[PDB]
Design an enzyme around this catalytic site. Structure first.
Site, PDB file in Angstrom:
ATOM      1  CD  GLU A   1      -2.091  -6.475   4.321  1.00  0.00           C
ATOM      2  OE1 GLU A   1      -1.485  -5.559   4.142  1.00  0.00           O
ATOM      3  OE2 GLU A   1      -3.251  -6.467   4.938  1.00  0.00           O
TER       4      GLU A   1
ATOM      5  CG  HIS B   1      -3.723  -7.232   0.266  1.00  0.00           C
ATOM      6  ND1 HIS B   1      -3.683  -6.490   1.356  1.00  0.00           N
ATOM      7  CD2 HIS B   1      -4.648  -7.803  -0.105  1.00  0.00           C
ATOM      8  CE1 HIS B   1      -4.596  -6.160   1.794  1.00  0.00           C
ATOM      9  NE2 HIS B   1      -5.473  -7.182   1.033  1.00  0.00           N
TER      10      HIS B   1
ATOM     11  CG  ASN C   1      -6.733   7.558  -7.724  1.00  0.00           C
ATOM     12  OD1 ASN C   1      -8.065   7.428  -6.756  1.00  0.00           O
ATOM     13  ND2 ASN C   1      -7.802   8.433  -9.059  1.00  0.00           N
TER      14      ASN C   1
ATOM     15  CG  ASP D   1      -1.738   1.822   1.314  1.00  0.00           C
ATOM     16  OD1 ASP D   1      -2.341   1.593   0.592  1.00  0.00           O
ATOM     17  OD2 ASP D   1      -1.269   2.482   2.565  1.00  0.00           O
TER      18      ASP D   1
ATOM     19  CD  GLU E   1       1.620  -5.758   0.950  1.00  0.00           C
ATOM     20  OE1 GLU E   1       0.112  -6.065   1.035  1.00  0.00           O
ATOM     21  OE2 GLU E   1       2.261  -5.045   1.824  1.00  0.00           O
TER      22      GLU E   1
ATOM     23  CG  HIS F   1       4.740  -3.983   4.404  1.00  0.00           C
ATOM     24  ND1 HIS F   1       4.422  -4.465   5.728  1.00  0.00           N
ATOM     25  CD2 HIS F   1       3.992  -3.082   4.233  1.00  0.00           C
ATOM     26  CE1 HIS F   1       3.276  -4.106   6.033  1.00  0.00           C
ATOM     27  NE2 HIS F   1       3.298  -3.304   5.063  1.00  0.00           N
TER      28      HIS F   1
ATOM     29  CG  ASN G   1      -3.163   5.850   6.136  1.00  0.00           C
ATOM     30  OD1 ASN G   1      -2.724   4.546   5.677  1.00  0.00           O
ATOM     31  ND2 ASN G   1      -3.538   6.462   6.118  1.00  0.00           N
TER      32      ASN G   1
ATOM     33  CG  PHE H   1      -6.246   3.385   2.129  1.00  0.00           C
ATOM     34  CD1 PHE H   1      -6.941   3.766   3.017  1.00  0.00           C
ATOM     35  CD2 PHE H   1      -5.313   2.731   1.512  1.00  0.00           C
ATOM     36  CE1 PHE H   1      -6.966   2.507   4.181  1.00  0.00           C
ATOM     37  CE2 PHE H   1      -5.611   1.329   2.702  1.00  0.00           C
ATOM     38  CZ  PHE H   1      -6.031   1.345   4.007  1.00  0.00           C
TER      39      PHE H   1
ATOM     40  CD  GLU I   1       0.129  -3.614   9.415  1.00  0.00           C
ATOM     41  OE1 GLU I   1      -1.216  -2.678   8.964  1.00  0.00           O
ATOM     42  OE2 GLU I   1       0.711  -3.744   8.497  1.00  0.00           O
TER      43      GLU I   1
ATOM     44  CG  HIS J   1       5.901   3.160   3.985  1.00  0.00           C
ATOM     45  ND1 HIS J   1       6.439   2.035   3.261  1.00  0.00           N
ATOM     46  CD2 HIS J   1       5.303   2.596   4.795  1.00  0.00           C
ATOM     47  CE1 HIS J   1       5.548   1.390   2.854  1.00  0.00           C
ATOM     48  NE2 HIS J   1       4.124   1.619   3.968  1.00  0.00           N
TER      49      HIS J   1
END
Ligand code: MG
Lengths: 1083, 90, 91, 90
Positions: free
Chosen positions: A440, A395, A566, A190, A393, A368, A573, A570, A506, A334
């Site tokens: 994930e 997902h 998009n 993400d 990852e 990640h 964070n 999100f 998390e 990140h």
């Protein structure tokens, strides 16, 4: 088949993984060090951008090719941040059509880099390597026209031996980089999709016979006193014949040296193993990061490795660090910069670490993927615990056992390579306590096999993977990990015997205005067994710095680059803004994560508990302060001796006190400078009420006048005139010495501008009736009543949803106005976002003062960090600029506030407290704009005066609600405050006197039959100017029988009936807590 | 004179279906007058129980309420003295 | 000879002569009979075949007395079962 | 088999940890005793008077069972049974 569409080919022509030796951080000086035979390839390269790999000019990799018309790009960088292509943000969905292992041929951004380099002659009696620290997502290498090979994992290095294909003097290097590959199916984090050579490139030279790899491990005895060193040294021979001398030297944190090994070795490929004993070594922790140095020399080859003595273990489900229970007080980070993307500098890395330590954070998860090597060196030097995570990852691919790439035989070697390249690079850092397999990416044999390889290679760290423990217990991990679990999940895990500790990888999603109920998680973690903490999601907002049409800066998110599809905001964070400016929620994290606990035994006696693992409280300067109506009257320094785990008593001599409110604050600060902060930095504080104030009630004797016409009621007192409308039922204007104070009427308000958590749980749809009730109302009835010293104006409204609201204004002869609200919700309405009043004043009211929690914004489920004191600010600094504008600026538990235009003060005081906020725009403006730059200029200030607002929540941001104890459930509510307009701030503790008593009548049957029911009727009449909340208790023969809560608005009568059952033959006393009594006879 | 009591509420965080919740309340009077108080316990917004207390000056009183019949899930416990807690029924 | 990475007894040397050709391992499997095949034992009980070939060493420690040494290994297995091995060597 | 003196600093009400290094042990039974005595004379007692002690089992013994190979004789008459072994008669 193309090599960039084949998951079974992970690389070609690359060397085997080894531990980082370049660059080296010297722990004595804090300076970076490079080898003697070293050439940096950072700087300008000739660059060519193409829309796909097939639109590249033919023969681009040859020496003869002409590139003199090519653009120049700086290395390292992401090319989306230099002008080429566009950045794309997607959460879970791939930015191309999902069909593994196939990537598009039409749209696949491509980059070609060319550079000429000068190799000295004396390098060719040695072995020469080209090192790429990181490239996203796939690249081909050409040297002097010839193909060497390729590489696929974006976040781990690629090294190539070039001694044969290189020549003295001038040589050509050519690299072709592809954005998307089969590799991209395991890089679905993400985050923003970028591309290019985004980390350093260099050439170095080693002797023919050299040390290829070093593994240094430590053990400690059962008393954590004496140590052992276990050293593996791998040697490699490339055509040497003569014998060389091997020396190994140990340098202590003090600076003393000792020779461990000195021997002669014949040139061959071999692993040498040694074991040494060390007496009472200095142990490494996050609190005390003591580093030893190993110096290794084979002929003219020299290397250095930093290491520490430390031991991580599980004993009976408890996590232990050097023998002590360890709590993880963490954050997810990140590797992101708003100007440079993934190409982050050392200066920014140092800023992140010092900010983390100044807010009581002890651990970071690399979410990640593996970070640059210098990140782990700085965590060793400054002292943070690290969870190092592999770049895996997927997902966007379904986690069903048949579909998931974690169970597919053709993806097996891709999963293994990504995990192995991380472990071999990072295995010597003492900061690393856990290996994480990924995030994930489903569950299957591809993870199970890689996890059994790690444990047989390294027995000194624990293994973590949330993708397996979300399905239940798993044999191949050491830690039980879940994402965003609710409180009942933690209390269930702690309710039985467990072999593994529980960690939240998390929790507390910090999207927008968030991080509610943080103290409630930590009250459970510190009380129950097997719970060892967690990592907040997350550190920094991924907002890209951009300019609008007018040229004012804003933070950009999904859909601000014409990128489709998009996922909007999100990616925003964080607990800090993109430039590392703290959000108000970072002050709550610092308070909840502090390592000193302080309890009140008595008003003068306090128990101090040390929760550090390895630090004595004698290292800190103690101070205490007493505040009187929010101002400091007494300060004193102290020192307290307490070892890890000890409780010590602190005795504070109190002064004689008057009728003011008194608060005590106790704090601990740094005695002297540290590498991460300056002398006087506060690490821990707590506050306590010493004495509640004595409120004064004064009898007003002066008079009030009243004039009615066809549309207005006008009330005059001293030099203030209050104007009420008979058509709207509102207070419309206040004239003070012929000067207008209001720009719009005083209205009841039930709405707040939705947060990112509110949007995620559909609050704007569910609670839409309360937004309507804030803008529309029907005046049912309006009346007024004059006495000698006061006038009351009463309005009754019905609202959308069919709820009732009663407003009462009482103007006294001294110019004070009492303002009262009662809300009676209808039987089928949902919970209420806010209860209060809203109005507007002219922008000349530019300064605010208050006595309450501060100095930052606080909310019902996020206010422990708010210290009670007296504060002063300009209106423009009473709000926070969230990347997406939202509810902001609330001050909680306020005794009084005042707005000033230099001459005139608008004063508000609570009965006994209010919440408030002040904004330089309308509620409608704040709800409309989606960027900070669009917030318009206005000639008024919006003022909110509130009973309460519902909590922020944030257990997650896609369905979770605030906890039950921070919601306004639909029942009757009342609320009042005092307002005065004058030239000076009056005493908040002095109010106008009013009558305070209800008129009551009780009635029932005099005689009933055994088996029948007695009906007791009660009337309550309120003839006072304030709403009353009352508990009506019914007693039968001296014992409590029943109770009803009632809210009685002014000038109203309420009727209750109680039913009394089970009365046997004889006479019985019925009485209440409101002075009514009757005998009843049971025939 | 000051007119307010100091209150603390406490209980079990988690219980089993069929078990009894014990809610403990401490009330401290540091004022110079005796206080008469009706202590009301609410369960999910509905009045559940009430106790009359007389607290002399410079004294602490302790109450226990027993709450029966709580089914599986989460429940709000609150009073008329500004104390509130979530309880989980396993 | 015990391995700290596998947690197994790997070799026995008697007068400098090797006795083991492979390590001592816990075993939960038998080669299916015709009756086992007929009642689908190889499908139903497949987790015990995996637990015979793969294991995770959770913890390993040793304790010396005057006349003996004990070596203790703790494993978790496929299916999430636990197995404890203890070797005590006497004088 | 082993004795050692120590001093421990503890204020009224305090708990303090005491670490005792143990020897390697054979098949015997091992007991630990910890005591506190007067450092110097008082008006009521002399130096070395014990005021407090406690004892703890460190290790249970290993019992030995030996196979007896030697023989036993038996003679009956009208009133007595006589059993002979080594140089004892029962
Ligand atoms: Mg935030």
């Amino acid at each position: 088949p193309y090599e960039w569409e084949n998951p079974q080919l992970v690389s070609e022509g690359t060397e085997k993984s080894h531990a980082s030796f370049i660059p080296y951080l010297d722990p004595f000086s804090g300076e970076w060090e490079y080898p003697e035979e070293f050439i940096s390839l950072n700087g300008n390269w000739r660059f060519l951008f193409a829309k796909n790999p097939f639109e590249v000019p033919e023969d681009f990799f040859s020496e003869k090719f002409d590139d003199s018309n090519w653009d120049e790009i700086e290395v390292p960088s992401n090319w989306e941040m230099k002008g080429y292509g566009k950045p794309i943000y997607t959460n879970v969905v791939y930015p191309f059509e999902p069909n593994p292992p196939f990537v598009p041929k039409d749209d696949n951004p491509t980059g070609v880099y060319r550079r000429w380099i000068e190799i000295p002659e004396d390098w060719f009696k040695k072995e020469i390597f080209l090192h790429f620290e990181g490239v996203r997502s796939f690249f081909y290498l050409w040297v002097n026209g010839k193909k060497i090979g390729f590489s696929k994992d974006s976040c781990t290095p690629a090294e190539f031996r070039l001694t044969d294909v290189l020549r003295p003097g001038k040589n050509l290097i050519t690299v072709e980089v592809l954005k998307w590959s089969d590799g991209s199916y395991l890089e679905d984090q993400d985050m923003w999709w970028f591309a290019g050579i985004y980390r350093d490139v260099y050439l170095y030279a080693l002797p023919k016979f050299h040390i290829r790899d070093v593994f240094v491990r430590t053990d400690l005895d059962e008393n954590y006193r004496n140590g052992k060193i276990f050293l593996d040294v791998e040697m490699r021979n490339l055509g040497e014949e003569e014998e060389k001398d091997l020396e190994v030297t140990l340098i202590t944190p003090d600076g003393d040296e000792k020779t461990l090994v000195k021997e002669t070795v014949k040139p061959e490929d071999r692993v040498l193993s040694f074991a040494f004993d060390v007496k009472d070594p200095k142990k490494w922790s996050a609190e005390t990061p003591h580093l030893y140095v190993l110096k290794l020399k084979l002929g003219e080859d020299e290397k250095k490795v930093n290491f520490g003595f430390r031991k991580i273990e599980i004993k009976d489900g408890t996590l232990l660090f050097n023998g002590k229970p360890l709590y993880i007080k963490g954050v997810n980070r990140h590797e992101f910069d708003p100007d440079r993307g993934h190409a982050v500098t050392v200066e920014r890395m140092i800023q992140d670490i010092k900010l983390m330590k100044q807010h009581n954070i002890n651990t970071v998860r690399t979410s990640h993927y593996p970070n640059q090597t210098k990140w782990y060196d700085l965590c060793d030097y400054f002292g943070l615990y690290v969870i190092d995570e592999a770049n895996i990852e997927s997902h966007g691919i379904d986690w069903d056992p048949e579909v998931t790439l974690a169970n597919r035989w053709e993806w097996e070697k891709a999963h293994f390579d990504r995990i192995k390249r991380m472990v071999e690079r990072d295995k010597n850092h003492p900061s690393i306590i856990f290996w994480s397999l990924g995030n994930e990416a489903g569950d299957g044999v591809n993870f199970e096999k890689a996890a059994l390889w790690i444990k047989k290679r390294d027995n000194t760290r624990l293994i973590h993977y949330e993708g397996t423990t979300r399905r239940g217990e798993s044999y191949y991990v050491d830690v039980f990990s879940l994402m965003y679990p609710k409180m009942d999940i933690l209390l269930e895990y702690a309710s039985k015997k467990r072999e593994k500790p529980f960690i939240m990888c998390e929790y507390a999603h910090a999207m927008g205005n968030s991080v509610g109920n943080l103290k409630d998680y930590w009250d459970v973690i510190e009380k129950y067994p097997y719970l060892h903490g967690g990592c907040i999601w997350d550190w920094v907002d991924q907002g890209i710095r951009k300019k609008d049409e007018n040229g004012r800066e804003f933070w950009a998110y999904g859909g601000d680059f014409g990128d489709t599809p998009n996922d909007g905001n999100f990616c925003i964070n964080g607990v800090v803004l993109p430039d590392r400016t703290p959000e108000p929620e970072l002050y709550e994290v610092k308070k909840v994560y502090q390592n000193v606990k302080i309890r009140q035994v008595s008003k003068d006696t306090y128990e101090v508990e040390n929760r550090y693992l390895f630090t004595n409280l004698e290292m800190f300067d103690g101070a205490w302060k007493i505040r009187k109506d929010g101002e400091v009257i007494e300060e004193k320094t102290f020192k307290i001796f307490a070892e890890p785990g000890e409780k010590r008593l602190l005795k504070i001599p109190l002064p004689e006190m008057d009728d003011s409110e008194y608060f005590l604050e106790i704090s601990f600060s740094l005695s002297e400078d540290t590498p991460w902060a300056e002398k006087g930095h506060v690490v821990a504080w707590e506050q306590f009420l010493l004495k509640a104030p004595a409120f004064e009630k004064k009898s007003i004797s002066d008079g009030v006048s009243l004039r009615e016409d066809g549309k207005h009621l006008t009330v005059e007192a001293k030099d203030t005139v209050y104007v009420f409308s008979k058509l709207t039922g509102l207070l419309e204007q206040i004239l003070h010495r012929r000067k207008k104070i209001l720009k719009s009427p005083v209205v009841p308000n039930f709405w707040r501008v939705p947060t990112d958590n509110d949007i995620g749980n559909r609050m704007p749809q569910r609670l839409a009736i309360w937004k309507r009730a804030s803008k529309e109302r029907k005046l049912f009835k309006m009346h007024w009543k004059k006495e000698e010293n006061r006038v009351s104006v009463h309005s009754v409204f019905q609202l959308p949803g069919n709820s009732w609201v009663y407003t009462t204004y009482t103007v006294f002869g001294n110019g004070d106005v009492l303002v009262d609200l009662s809300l009676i919700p209808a039987e089928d309405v949902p919970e209420i976002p806010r209860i209060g009043f809203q109005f507007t004043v002219p922008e000349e009211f530019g300064t605010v003062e208050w006595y309450g929690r501060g100095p930052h914004e606080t909310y019902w489920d996020r206010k422990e960090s708010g210290l009670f004191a007296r504060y002063r600010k300009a209106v423009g600094e009473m709000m926070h600029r969230y990347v997406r504008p939202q509810e902001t600026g609330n001050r909680s538990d306020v005794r009084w506030f005042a707005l000033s235009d230099g001459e005139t003060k608008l004063f508000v005081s609570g009965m006994p407290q209010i919440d408030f906020s002040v904004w330089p725009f309308s509620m409608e403006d704040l709800e409309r704009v989606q960027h900070i730059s669009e917030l318009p200029e206005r000639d008024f200030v919006t003022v909110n005066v509130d009973f309460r607002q519902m909590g922020l929540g944030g257990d997650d941001s896609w369905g979770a609600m605030p906890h039950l104890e921070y919601r306004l459930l639909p029942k009757p509510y009342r609320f009042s405050f005092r307002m005065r307009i004058s030239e000076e701030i009056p005493s908040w503790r002095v109010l106008a006197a009013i009558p305070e008593t209800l008129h009551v009548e009780m009635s029932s049957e005099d005689v009933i039959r055994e088996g029948d029911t007695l009906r007791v009727k009660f009337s309550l009449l309120n003839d006072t100017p304030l709403s009353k909340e009352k508990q009506v208790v019914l007693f039968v023969d001296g014992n409590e029988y029943s109770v009803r809560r009632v809210v009685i608005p002014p000038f109203k009568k309420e009727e209750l009936v109680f039913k009394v059952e089970g009365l046997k033959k004889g006479e019985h006393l019925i009485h209440t807590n409101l002075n009514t009594r009757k005998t009843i006879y049971v025939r």
